[PDB]
Scaffold this motif. Sequence first.
Motif, PDB file in Angstrom:
ATOM      1  N   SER C 124       0.831  -1.204   0.000  1.00  0.00           N
ATOM      2  CA  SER C 124       0.000   0.000   0.000  1.00  0.00           C
ATOM      3  C   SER C 124       0.866   1.254   0.000  1.00  0.00           C
ATOM      4  O   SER C 124       0.621   2.179  -0.764  1.00  0.00           O
ATOM      5  CB  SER C 124      -0.949   0.006   1.201  1.00  0.00           C
ATOM      6  N   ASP C 125       1.840   1.302   0.901  1.00  0.00           N
ATOM      7  CA  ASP C 125       2.729   2.451   1.016  1.00  0.00           C
ATOM      8  C   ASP C 125       3.665   2.521  -0.182  1.00  0.00           C
ATOM      9  O   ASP C 125       4.131   3.597  -0.551  1.00  0.00           O
ATOM     10  CB  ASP C 125       3.532   2.383   2.314  1.00  0.00           C
ATOM     11  N   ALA C 126       3.947   1.368  -0.782  1.00  0.00           N
ATOM     12  CA  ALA C 126       4.736   1.366  -2.001  1.00  0.00           C
ATOM     13  C   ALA C 126       3.941   1.988  -3.148  1.00  0.00           C
ATOM     14  O   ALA C 126       4.515   2.440  -4.135  1.00  0.00           O
ATOM     15  CB  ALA C 126       5.168  -0.044  -2.344  1.00  0.00           C
ATOM     16  N   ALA C 127       2.614   2.009  -3.003  1.00  0.00           N
ATOM     17  CA  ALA C 127       1.739   2.594  -4.032  1.00  0.00           C
ATOM     18  C   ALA C 127       2.072   4.071  -4.298  1.00  0.00           C
ATOM     19  O   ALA C 127       2.277   4.467  -5.448  1.00  0.00           O
ATOM     20  CB  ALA C 127       0.271   2.444  -3.638  1.00  0.00           C
ATOM     21  N   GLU C 128       2.125   4.879  -3.240  1.00  0.00           N
ATOM     22  CA  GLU C 128       2.455   6.302  -3.377  1.00  0.00           C
ATOM     23  C   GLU C 128       3.907   6.550  -2.982  1.00  0.00           C
ATOM     24  O   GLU C 128       4.318   7.692  -2.754  1.00  0.00           O
ATOM     25  CB  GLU C 128       1.524   7.177  -2.527  1.00  0.00           C
ATOM     26  N   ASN C 129       4.672   5.462  -2.936  1.00  0.00           N
ATOM     27  CA  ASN C 129       6.086   5.441  -2.541  1.00  0.00           C
ATOM     28  C   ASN C 129       6.475   6.364  -1.383  1.00  0.00           C
ATOM     29  O   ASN C 129       7.259   7.299  -1.551  1.00  0.00           O
ATOM     30  CB  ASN C 129       6.992   5.732  -3.755  1.00  0.00           C
ATOM     31  N   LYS C 130       5.924   6.090  -0.206  1.00  0.00           N
ATOM     32  CA  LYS C 130       6.327   6.815   0.991  1.00  0.00           C
ATOM     33  C   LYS C 130       6.649   5.851   2.135  1.00  0.00           C
ATOM     34  O   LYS C 130       6.809   6.270   3.282  1.00  0.00           O
ATOM     35  CB  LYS C 130       5.240   7.804   1.417  1.00  0.00           C
ATOM     36  N   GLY C 131       6.754   4.563   1.813  1.00  0.00           N
ATOM     37  CA  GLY C 131       7.038   3.532   2.802  1.00  0.00           C
ATOM     38  C   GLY C 131       8.510   3.411   3.174  1.00  0.00           C
ATOM     39  O   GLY C 131       9.339   4.198   2.717  1.00  0.00           O
ATOM     40  N   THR C 132       8.834   2.442   4.026  1.00  0.00           N
ATOM     41  CA  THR C 132      10.209   2.255   4.486  1.00  0.00           C
ATOM     42  C   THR C 132      11.103   1.668   3.396  1.00  0.00           C
ATOM     43  O   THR C 132      12.292   1.989   3.305  1.00  0.00           O
ATOM     44  CB  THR C 132      10.261   1.333   5.717  1.00  0.00           C
ATOM     45  N   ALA C 133      10.517   0.821   2.560  1.00  0.00           N
ATOM     46  CA  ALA C 133      11.257   0.177   1.486  1.00  0.00           C
ATOM     47  C   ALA C 133      11.674   1.186   0.418  1.00  0.00           C
ATOM     48  O   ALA C 133      12.785   1.116  -0.135  1.00  0.00           O
ATOM     49  CB  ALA C 133      10.424  -0.942   0.869  1.00  0.00           C
ATOM     50  N   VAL C 134      10.796   2.145   0.143  1.00  0.00           N
ATOM     51  CA  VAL C 134      11.123   3.148  -0.851  1.00  0.00           C
ATOM     52  C   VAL C 134      12.229   4.022  -0.274  1.00  0.00           C
ATOM     53  O   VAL C 134      13.099   4.477  -1.008  1.00  0.00           O
ATOM     54  CB  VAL C 134       9.898   4.004  -1.274  1.00  0.00           C
ATOM     55  N   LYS C 135      12.241   4.177   1.047  1.00  0.00           N
ATOM     56  CA  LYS C 135      13.312   4.899   1.724  1.00  0.00           C
ATOM     57  C   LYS C 135      14.627   4.147   1.544  1.00  0.00           C
ATOM     58  O   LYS C 135      15.673   4.758   1.298  1.00  0.00           O
ATOM     59  CB  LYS C 135      12.993   5.087   3.208  1.00  0.00           C
ATOM     60  N   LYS C 136      14.561   2.822   1.674  1.00  0.00           N
ATOM     61  CA  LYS C 136      15.707   1.963   1.394  1.00  0.00           C
ATOM     62  C   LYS C 136      16.237   2.233  -0.014  1.00  0.00           C
ATOM     63  O   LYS C 136      17.443   2.405  -0.201  1.00  0.00           O
ATOM     64  CB  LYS C 136      15.320   0.491   1.544  1.00  0.00           C
ATOM     65  N   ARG C 137      15.334   2.274  -0.997  1.00  0.00           N
ATOM     66  CA  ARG C 137      15.726   2.548  -2.385  1.00  0.00           C
ATOM     67  C   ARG C 137      16.420   3.902  -2.494  1.00  0.00           C
ATOM     68  O   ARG C 137      17.450   4.039  -3.168  1.00  0.00           O
ATOM     69  CB  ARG C 137      14.504   2.507  -3.296  1.00  0.00           C
ATOM     70  N   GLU C 138      15.858   4.895  -1.808  1.00  0.00           N
ATOM     71  CA  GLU C 138      16.414   6.243  -1.807  1.00  0.00           C
ATOM     72  C   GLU C 138      17.840   6.224  -1.307  1.00  0.00           C
ATOM     73  O   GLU C 138      18.733   6.708  -1.983  1.00  0.00           O
ATOM     74  CB  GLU C 138      15.593   7.211  -0.961  1.00  0.00           C
ATOM     75  N   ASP C 139      18.042   5.681  -0.111  1.00  0.00           N
ATOM     76  CA  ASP C 139      19.376   5.635   0.484  1.00  0.00           C
ATOM     77  C   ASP C 139      20.364   4.848  -0.380  1.00  0.00           C
ATOM     78  O   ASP C 139      21.540   5.223  -0.488  1.00  0.00           O
ATOM     79  CB  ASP C 139      19.314   5.034   1.889  1.00  0.00           C
ATOM     80  N   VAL C 140      19.884   3.773  -1.002  1.00  0.00           N
ATOM     81  CA  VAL C 140      20.709   3.027  -1.942  1.00  0.00           C
ATOM     82  C   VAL C 140      21.118   3.973  -3.072  1.00  0.00           C
ATOM     83  O   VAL C 140      22.228   3.880  -3.597  1.00  0.00           O
ATOM     84  CB  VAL C 140      19.977   1.780  -2.489  1.00  0.00           C
ATOM     85  N   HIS C 141      20.228   4.891  -3.441  1.00  0.00           N
ATOM     86  CA  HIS C 141      20.567   5.894  -4.452  1.00  0.00           C
ATOM     87  C   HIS C 141      21.562   6.942  -3.942  1.00  0.00           C
ATOM     88  O   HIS C 141      22.380   7.447  -4.704  1.00  0.00           O
ATOM     89  CB  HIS C 141      19.307   6.573  -4.973  1.00  0.00           C
TER      90      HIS C 141
END
Lengths: 127, 98, 151, 101, 79, 114, 206
Positions: C124-141
């Motif tokens: 659900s949070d990945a839907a509007e990309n504001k979840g913890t996993a998308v944060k993981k992706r960000e930091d990986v970036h």
Amino acid sequence: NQYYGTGRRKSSAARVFIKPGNGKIVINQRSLEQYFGRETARMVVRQPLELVDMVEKLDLYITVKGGGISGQAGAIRHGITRALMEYDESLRSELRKAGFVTRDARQVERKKVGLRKARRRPQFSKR
Amino acid sequence: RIRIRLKAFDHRLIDQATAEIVETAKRTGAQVRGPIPLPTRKERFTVLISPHVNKDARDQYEIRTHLRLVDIVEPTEKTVDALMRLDLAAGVDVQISL
Amino acid sequence: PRRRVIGQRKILPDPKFGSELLAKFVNILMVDGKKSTAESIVYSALETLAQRSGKSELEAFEVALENVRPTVEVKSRRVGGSTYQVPVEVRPVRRNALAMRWIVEAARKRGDKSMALRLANELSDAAENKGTAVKKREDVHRMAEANKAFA
Amino acid sequence: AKQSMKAREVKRVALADKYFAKRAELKAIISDVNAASDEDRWNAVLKLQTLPRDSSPSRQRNRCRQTGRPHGFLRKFGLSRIKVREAAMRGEIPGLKKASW
Amino acid sequence: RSLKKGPFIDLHLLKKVEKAVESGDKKPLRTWSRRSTIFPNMIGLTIAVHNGRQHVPVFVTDEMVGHKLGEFAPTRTYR
Amino acid sequence: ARIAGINIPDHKHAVIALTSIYGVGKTRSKAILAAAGIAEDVKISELSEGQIDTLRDEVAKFVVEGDLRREISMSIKRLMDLGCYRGLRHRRGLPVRGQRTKTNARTRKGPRKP
Amino acid sequence: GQKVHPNGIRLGIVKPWNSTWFANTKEFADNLDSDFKVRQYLTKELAKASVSRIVIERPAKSIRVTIHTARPGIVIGKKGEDVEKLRKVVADIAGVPAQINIAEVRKPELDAKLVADSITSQLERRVMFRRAMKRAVQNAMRLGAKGIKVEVSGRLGGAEIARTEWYREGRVPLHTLRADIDYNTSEAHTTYGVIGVKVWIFKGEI
RNA sequence: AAGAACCUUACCUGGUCUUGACAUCCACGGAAGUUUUCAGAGAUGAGAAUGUGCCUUCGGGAACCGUGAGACAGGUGCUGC
RNA sequence: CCGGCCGGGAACUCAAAGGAGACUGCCAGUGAUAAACUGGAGGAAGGUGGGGAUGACGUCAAGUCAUCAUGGCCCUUACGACCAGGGCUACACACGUGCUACAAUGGCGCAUACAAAGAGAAGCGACCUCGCGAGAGCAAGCGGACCUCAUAAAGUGCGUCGUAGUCCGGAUUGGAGUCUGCAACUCGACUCCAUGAAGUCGGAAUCGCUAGUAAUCGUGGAUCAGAAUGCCACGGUGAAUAC
Ligand SMILES: [Mg+2]
Ligand SMILES: [Mg+2]
Ligand SMILES: [Mg+2]
Ligand SMILES: [Mg+2]
Ligand SMILES: [Mg+2]
Ligand SMILES: [Mg+2]
Ligand SMILES: [Mg+2]
Ligand SMILES: [Mg+2]
Ligand SMILES: [Mg+2]
Ligand SMILES: [Mg+2]
Ligand SMILES: [Mg+2]
Ligand SMILES: [Mg+2]
Ligand SMILES: [Mg+2]
């Protein structure tokens, strides 16, 4: 008439008699619906029926003993692939270029001495 | 009627024990049910190979025991007495049953 | 390996609706080898997502995976001594899998209640990309780009 | 393995043969639920100590017949693991080839 | 917690106790049968249980009846 | 929700809420609930008072709470008085059922510190 | 030591067992023990007759001993009376009865036990271990053998330290299971201690 | 060590045995054994009844059992450098 | 009486023998037209198919003289021998290897599915009876593919539990027991009742593992009167990743 096939994925040894007729899949009296038709991989027995249609073409008198759920199911798949010989290689062209017919042995390794379970080394300690 | 059962260790020693116990019976009085295979009893042993310490290193031995059924579905007289005092084949134990 | 140019194993497609990609997801959720329970949780999580989003599953698990999915990542590749990070494009095959791994890893925390609940929420949070996993992706970036001077 | 110990062992074995598996009735029979539950059974658990401390099979350590090693025993062979291997490799014990399944 | 049918005693100690109580009070009894239970009829006698290298006398009382002798003869001394 | 010495829980199934009473575990709690005719699924909050007393009369039959307490105090103390091996262990704060003292026995021996 | 026993590894394939008798799971052990008995005794007696091996077969509750040896005459004696004596004293401990069958071997230099005990009997008599070992190898290879290697180990020569020395000739493949390899170790008690003399004899490709 | 409650057990305390628990040699006496009793922690000490066989050089036998004398026996005692 | 339970069948599973089969043999391309290599075909199986056994010359004057054998040396009314009791199970502490955990992919209750490998006679011990239970009584069959240990467990359905140190955890202790055994105090296993500890995923650090492997789930054996989370062995479920 009636065509037989063996198959025996991991330990379990299925026997698949097959005939043309009703779409019901009988196995050890138990219906395919109630033997494991509710659990996961309920259709791995119905897999070799995609490129070679079933629907109402053929009834299956399957039997099985030994192994476990999924193992039995695999044995059934294999047994069906072996049972589909009434129209020979013409079915095997697509039946093989999709796996199915491969025996797929890969049995459980014997426990090795000195180890713990065939590969698991019993914890090394430097000092 | 004659339930003969004979077991041994070396498989190819009982092969001729059965072939010969069946020939010296099946030919003089006929009737046989053949050498029924039966499961082979396999006792295993996992002894320590070292006189002291070294638990890791072990030898594992086994003793294959090959059983054979004979069966003669008639008490043929030329055959029922061809079992006694006409057995031999040492190294193979043979128990006849009535 | 040192030499073995072995290929990838071929998994079985999902028993329910055909989706090898998320059957791959189920595998990365199978604790103690119990594929059953894990797959049950997957489904349960995807039904409560087909409802709260309106999307199906193959499209619901899609427009959520792409938001947690890495484009470039770091992994040290020293040349002649110094061992500094070298950003490199992640293979597509490893790509999405790594994204699923981050999703489940996030689902191991963020303790709602039931596991199915938690995972569903994660998507659900990945839907509007504001979840913890998308944060993981960000930091990986952040590991790259800001450190992409190495090439 | 200490001749003394071997002796002790054989005396235990034989002396144990003399009594029990014969006079085990004192506890296997008189020690039962019936009318003998009275003073008779008590007389039994009394008399059971009149016998020598041995006689009981639970004092036969059961050693190797050759070396007399108290440990590493195999009831199938009666020999110590060291001796069963030492013999097996010489082709002594029949049908005992190296297992490899 | 063991031996469901009848208490256990060694004959030399059982009879020693019988002859002791029937003869009247005297001196501690040198017995090695720590394995033996304590009868009610043993109350009074201060028999000395063997600990492994000595004998510790114990004046058997109203409570020391269900317990065996070894309970009252500590062996391994600690500091 | 006040039977016996205490038992003051809330929103719990009758059996677990009776396990809250010292001196009675699960099984004995089922015994109680069968002796009162009360089903073991209903919560104490749902359980009417007229039934609360029937439970009381039943839990009075079993030794519970403080009475049990001084029963255990009587046992352990009596053991320490006799000077038997078990009481001897009781005084020294070491395992009684013959557990390995050399390494573990960290529950009875107390927390590892010095 | 790290090598497998040459005989054991082939017990099923090429090599046979010395004991040939099926037994029930009960009287198996005890019978085996009586066997060890008659073997150690028989060897301890007919040692001078140069015995190579014995085969203890057991037909119809009656024991049958076979003695493969290089000197059947010394074993039997005059008229074969020693045979009788042995049937008595040996049958006694074997459970009785015991028909024995001596078996001659006209090629003694090819039996590992015989060569071993030979080198040993030379070693007790102060003779140089090299002359004995090399003599054995020499006579073996020229007598007709595809391979042979001998190995002595211990104080040999009365040295303060023990040093193993092996001498070989021909092809002796210990790993080739189809290969028929004779093998025997034999302790050689000396004034300075025990000296092991283990010998391999590759008799044939199969 | 593929399994220390006794035994195992090699350790300790106490009570004990000494050509000895295990082997052969010689002299001497006794079928072996079995039932049971008292002292003792037991080992052992003291008995009490019974049974008294396989070959007759029959001053001996083949086992078995006890004392005598010396050879020896015995050691999980030290050194795997 | 639907139990292969009975006729009967020898098809099929399985059982054990005897054989067949896989050799880069065939095909393409590459490579010095060589070995070889990458790919394809067919094939159950693809290039040492899987796994085991098998351990070269030696290295460590590694380990064991306490399994055994043996040179020295040493004791030889004793360092040998017999017996009872004690100890090898002690515990301020330190480490190694394990097991059970900390929970909701989970605990609990009811229902129900699917194994292989074994072991067994001074042994395995159905059935039936009593006992909350461990078990006890009585007593078939079976030295056995038939008789027993022997209901596999995770799983699956349904109900409850709501994130609390809790219906988690199960240590500790009390009480009452059963079993083997002359004897269970020192120091056994198991059952019942009550008790209900630390522990909320672990500092520095470090280990195992590339597949039916890791992980998790139970079963059997040897040793053994009794006494395993250890060792050895069997099957169920079954991944992740290798640029
Ligand atoms: Mg000795
Ligand atoms: Mg024992
Ligand atoms: Mg002891
Ligand atoms: Mg002393
Ligand atoms: Mg060394
Ligand atoms: Mg050294
Ligand atoms: Mg050392
Ligand atoms: Mg003792
Ligand atoms: Mg210890
Ligand atoms: Mg619980
Ligand atoms: Mg706490
Ligand atoms: Mg690997
Ligand atoms: Mg990869």
